[PDB]
RNA sequence: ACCGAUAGUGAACCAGUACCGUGAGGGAAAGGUGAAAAGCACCCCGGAAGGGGAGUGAAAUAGAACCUGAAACCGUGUGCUUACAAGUAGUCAGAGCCCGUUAAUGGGUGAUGGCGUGCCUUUUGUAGAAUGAACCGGCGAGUUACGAUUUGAUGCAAGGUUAAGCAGUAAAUGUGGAGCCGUAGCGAAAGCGAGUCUGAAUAGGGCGUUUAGUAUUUGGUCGUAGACCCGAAACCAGGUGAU
RNA sequence: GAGGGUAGCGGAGAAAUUCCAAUCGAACCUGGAGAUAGCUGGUUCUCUCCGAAAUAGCUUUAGGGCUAGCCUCAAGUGAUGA
RNA sequence: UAACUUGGGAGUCAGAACAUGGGUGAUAAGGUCCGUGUUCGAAAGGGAAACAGCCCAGACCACCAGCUAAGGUCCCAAAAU
RNA sequence: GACAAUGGUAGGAGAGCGUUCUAAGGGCGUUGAAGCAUGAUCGUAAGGACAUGUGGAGCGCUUAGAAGUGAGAAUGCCGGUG
């Protein structure tokens, strides 16, 4: 702004006498070079909303992706060893769109460090699910513990 | 769809910009009119008022005083009983449990707004004499 | 975001500049001076529509009054000489016939007559 | 748009001649001017010249009425400092009757660039002879 | 969901530099060949600068004053028109003479006729001889934070809602019930309570008994901060000057 | 002529409000600082509907302000308007 | 065919001419101060030569159609020598 | 289909055009993007296309989000030219 824009402490000319128009300082805003008035300012954008309109939320993207037939329940992910060939294949077993979302229960370090190289896979856990997570993927691909586990922690 | 979005029906508006032309209706002098105090930057006169005429919160008397040692009684009317169980035991640590009292200020009331048709018995600091009358009435017991 | 001007405020200003071609000298040449010009060009041609229909009534009304001289009568008695008939033709039709068909404008002027 | 518009193709003029003997001044010059303008043709255009070419013979002997032989008077200034000029309509009968004629016809055209051209067609001579025989001019009665 | 060379630091480049002042001190302008210098051997006009060929290159109207190259302004050549005429320069009507479209009751020019005293601001009232603008281009003015109130939407409902903190990817949301609003008023207060105050007296009178709120958020307005932008004559504090 | 001294709430003045770096009824520079301005000037795109006032009272007030009168939008009563 | 009530947002507090009822002035002023109507302000179009306030009359747009108001009909200039 | 309304300053209310960036989806481009120039084109307005030259590498469309979001005037600031 005016202040903080470099120099601009003394008056360029006399207040009257010779014709020109009445000036205070070098950094005003219609100068070139001068301060800005009214523009950006660091803050930030983040709201909240009630508990119980966070939790109908995401009940509304989990029956939404039920409705469409974008469920997929299957038995446990059994990888040893991280690979990412081998889950290609299982994905392409399944008959499953290129985006997904595969939901666990814990953390399953061998199957986060593959099927995560293909380009619109991730995998999140039960306490990790998102309503942008659900509504940008484009079928949900489950496990029967991850599926209680969300079935008992929302309601 | 994340690109099919729809906010609900009314919810939104948009925001009104003065000083953008004449055809807005709002373009020369943005809405404040023409040469006066109100039409100039930084705005005019206090809230209440400034100069002029004395104002009416100086030309009327002050009035009381406060006392410190003040006690207010969170009140419980006979309709808010029903809700117990007949024949049980009312305590004020349990009518701040069930939902009744919220915040305990400086003890419980009970007044006599309603009816009872109850047979409980109630333990509280206060009573008034409907409260007192109308439990005992229907059989029932009181302390303080 | 910071947006700059550039592409829109050139792009309004030649629409109006190629409005003023043929006016004299810096009228078809300079903005401001030209976006006077075409402001009253539109005010000049609202009052000009209108005042057509008067410049061209009076245009027939005299051939009319010249063509009933030549019959040793006047324009007004013409006119009440129909009406009292039933003729019903505007002067636009009545110019139109004195000055082709010589013989077919006697054949109303007689009618006019007829009925005084 | 049926409207007819006359235009050089297909004008046509003719020669009139008028005479000036025992007439008003003025009731005379007015049923002029309506003649030379083309006020009497079915194919009057406002933008063309249409009338016909007048001959103004007998010049003298115009009338006036009452006492206009010494009371009407033309003024006139030479735009030079202190300079106005006058005269008598009845000194100006008897010693130039034909510019008497002329600038009174004249004073009821309009002052346009066709008003200039639609008054050179008048020819005002003060005898009863006139030489544009080359022509054949048809004798007027005034309405 | 910051800037992109009038922006972003005063400074993208040899910038606290050119420059200005005795001194303290004030302070700029200036980016862009090409993928690769392959940066025009050689011939012609000239003293030279400059140019015309020939070559390089995809391209030289990319030749170092080098990407793109607008407007003001200055020139050359041409279709229609102008030396008797009184013009805020246009608009409506209209012959004649030349062209041929995003193909449609087409384009350029204009012999004549009718009508017609610029724009903004400020005023009871301005063609005004009241103000402002030489022309073109870029830049140049109701914003944000925290509170209050009112309106729309959404969730729950005699209840509604968490703050700090902790865990988590600087997220979403878990957890956290200190605290806040409402469910009951009246009175200066003690106090009483669907009723209370005044009063000897519901006698009369005043304010209440509607007894549905509450949290987030779009829009309007207000308050505290410079608060729509530019403009003083002055006041105070610390320093620099008797060339 | 050369070398020195007196500094702004001050210095110098054969006295004129005269001089103190082309400036003096109180020098210049940098800060408080975006001082304050009931005063001039300015305030950027387009359509649709409605459409004023230049009055009263009080005012350290008179070219300023506050309440009332006149305009607009939303909800309610509904015949109470001419 | 309006009026009253409750809420959100204003602008206005320099007015002028004409007719009429009065004060003041000198039965002066395009003077000044009040009451009562109109127009301008914030109103284009026709008439009064030109001429915010006088007479007629309230422009959504297009047409080379018809009837009227004020005011007019010898020529400029539309319509009775 | 029948009727009715639509001059307007201060000011109130409503519906829209265009500009830069983000998200999701779907596309164009050396067989030539943006920008610039011309044209006798389209819509009620702000404004949107198409064809041909120049140009040599990026850019539109749909639905949402957020603003340093629109210039003719301040004896306005900077550059160029009368």
Same mark, same amino acid.
């Given at each position: 702004?005016?202040?903080?824009?470099?120099?601009?402490?003394?008056?360029?000319?006399?207040?009257?006498?010779?014709?020109?128009?009445?000036?205070?300082?070098?950094?005003?805003?219609?100068?070139?070079?001068?301060?800005?008035?009214?523009?950006?300012?660091?803050?930030?954008?983040?709201?909240?909303?009630?508990?119980?309109?966070?939790?109908?939320? @995401?009940?509304?993207?989990?029956?939404?992706?039920?409705?469409?037939?974008?469920?997929?329940?299957?038995?446990?992910?059994?990888?040893?060893?991280?690979?990412?060939?081998?889950?290609?294949?299982? @994905?392409?077993?399944?008959?499953?769109?290129?985006?997904?979302?595969?939901?666990?229960?814990?953390?399953?370090?061998?199957?986060? @460090?593959?099927?995560?190289?293909?380009?619109?896979?991730?995998?999140?856990?039960?306490?990790?699910?998102?309503? @942008?997570?659900?509504?940008?993927?484009?079928?949900?691909?489950?496990?029967?513990?991850?599926?209680?586990?969300?079935?008992?922690?929302?309601? | 769809?994340?690109?099919?979005?729809?906010?609900?029906?009314?919810?939104?508006?948009?925001? =009104?910009?003065?000083?953008?032309?004449?055809?807005?209706?709002?373009?020369?002098?943005?809405?404040?009119?023409?040469?006066?105090?109100?039409?100039?930057?930084?705005?005019?006169?206090?809230?209440?008022?400034?100069?002029?005429?004395?104002?009416?919160?100086?030309?009327?008397?002050?009035?009381?005083?406060?006392?410190?040692?003040?006690?207010?009684?969170?009140?419980?009317?006979?309709?808010?009983?029903?809700?117990?169980?007949?024949?049980?035991?009312?305590?004020?640590?349990?009518?701040?449990?069930?939902?009744?009292?919220? =915040?305990?200020?400086?003890?419980?009331?009970?007044?006599?707004?309603?009816?009872?048709?109850?047979?409980?018995?109630?333990?509280?600091?206060?009573?008034?004499?409907?409260?007192?009358?109308?439990?005992?009435?229907?059989?029932?017991?009181?302390?303080? | 975001?910071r947006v700059k001007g550039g592409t829109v405020t050139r792009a309004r200003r030649k629409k109006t500049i190629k409005l003023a071609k043929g006016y004299f000298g810096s009228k078809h040449t300079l903005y401001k001076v030209a976006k006077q010009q075409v402001m009253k060009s539109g005010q000049y041609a609202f009052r000009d529509r209108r005042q057509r229909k008067r410049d061209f009534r009076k245009l027939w009304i005299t051939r009319i009054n010249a063509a009933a001289?030549?019959?040793?009568?006047?324009?007004?008695?013409?006119?009440?000489?129909?009406?009292?008939?039933?003729?019903?033709?505007?002067?636009?039709?009545?110019?139109?016939?004195?000055?082709?068909?010589?013989?077919?404008?006697?054949?109303?002027?007689?009618?006019?007559?007829?009925?005084? | 748009?049926?409207?007819?518009?006359?235009?050089?193709?297909?004008?046509?003029?003719?020669? !009139?001649?008028?005479?000036?003997?025992?007439?008003?001044?003025?009731?005379?010059?007015?049923?002029?001017?309506?003649? $030379?303008?083309?006020?009497?043709?079915?194919?009057?255009?406002?933008?063309?010249?249409?009338?016909? !070419?007048?001959?103004?013979?007998?010049?003298?002997?115009?009338?006036?009425?009452?006492?206009?032989?010494?009371?009407?008077?033309?003024?006139?200034?030479?735009?030079?400092?202190?300079?106005?000029?006058?005269?008598?309509?009845?000194?100006?009968?008897?010693?130039?009757?034909?510019? $008497?004629?002329?600038?009174?016809?004249?004073?009821?055209?309009?002052?346009?660039?066709?008003?200039?051209?639609?008054?050179?067609? $008048?020819?005002?001579?003060?005898?009863?002879?006139?030489?544009?025989?080359?022509?054949?001019?048809?004798? !007027?009665?005034?309405?």
């Amino acid at each position: 702004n005016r202040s903080a824009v470099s120099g601009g402490g003394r008056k360029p000319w006399k207040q009257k006498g010779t014709g020109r128009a009445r000036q205070g300082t070098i950094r005003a805003p219609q100068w070139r070079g001068g301060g800005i008035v009214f523009g950006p300012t660091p803050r930030s954008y983040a709201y909240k909303m009630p508990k119980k309109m966070r939790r109908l939320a @995401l009940r509304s993207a989990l029956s939404f992706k039920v409705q469409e037939n974008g469920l997929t329940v299957v038995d446990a992910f059994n990888f040893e060893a991280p690979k990412t060939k081998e889950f290609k294949n299982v @994905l392409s077993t399944l008959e499953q769109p290129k985006k997904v979302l595969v939901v666990t229960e814990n953390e399953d370090v061998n199957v986060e @460090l593959s099927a995560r190289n293909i380009p619109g896979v991730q995998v999140t856990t039960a306490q990790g699910l998102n309503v @942008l997570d659900i509504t940008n993927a484009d079928s949900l691909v489950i496990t029967e513990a991850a599926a209680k586990k969300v079935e008992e922690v929302l309601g | 769809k994340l690109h099919e979005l729809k906010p609900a029906e009314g919810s939104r508006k948009e925001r =009104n910009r003065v000083g953008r032309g004449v055809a807005t209706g709002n373009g020369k002098t943005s809405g404040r009119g023409h040469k006066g105090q109100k039409a100039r930057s930084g705005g005019g006169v206090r809230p209440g008022f400034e100069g002029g005429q004395l104002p009416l919160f100086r030309r009327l008397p002050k009035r009381g005083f406060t006392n410190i040692n003040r006690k207010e009684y969170a009140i419980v009317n006979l309709d808010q009983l029903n809700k117990f169980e007949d024949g049980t035991e009312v305590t004020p640590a349990l009518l701040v449990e069930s939902g009744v009292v919220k =915040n305990e200020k400086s003890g419980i009331k009970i007044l006599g707004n309603g009816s009872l048709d109850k047979k409980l018995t109630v333990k509280a600091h206060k009573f008034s004499a409907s409260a007192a009358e109308a439990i005992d009435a229907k059989g029932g017991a009181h302390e303080v | 975001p910071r947006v700059k001007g550039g592409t829109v405020t050139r792009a309004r200003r030649k629409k109006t500049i190629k409005l003023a071609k043929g006016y004299f000298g810096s009228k078809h040449t300079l903005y401001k001076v030209a976006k006077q010009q075409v402001m009253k060009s539109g005010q000049y041609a609202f009052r000009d529509r209108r005042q057509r229909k008067r410049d061209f009534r009076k245009l027939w009304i005299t051939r009319i009054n010249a063509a009933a001289r030549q019959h040793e009568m006047s324009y007004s008695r013409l006119m009440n000489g129909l009406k009292k008939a039933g003729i019903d033709i505007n002067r636009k039709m009545l110019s139109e016939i004195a000055i082709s068909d010589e013989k077919a404008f006697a054949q109303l002027v007689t009618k006019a007559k007829d009925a005084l | 748009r049926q409207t007819f518009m006359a235009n050089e193709s297909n004008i046509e003029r003719k020669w !009139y001649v008028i005479d000036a003997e025992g007439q008003t001044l003025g009731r005379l010059s007015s049923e002029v001017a309506s003649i $030379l303008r083309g006020k009497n043709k079915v194919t009057y255009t406002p933008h063309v010249d249409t009338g016909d !070419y007048v001959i103004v013979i007998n010049a003298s002997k115009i009338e006036f009425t009452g006492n206009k032989e010494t009371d009407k008077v033309y003024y006139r200034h030479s735009n030079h400092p202190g300079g106005i000029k006058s005269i008598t309509a009845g000194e100006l009968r008897r010693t130039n009757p034909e510019r $008497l004629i002329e600038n009174s016809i004249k004073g009821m055209l309009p002052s346009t660039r066709l008003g200039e051209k639609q008054g050179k067609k $008048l020819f005002v001579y003060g005898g009863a002879e006139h030489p544009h025989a080359a022509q054949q001019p048809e004798n !007027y009665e005034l309405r």
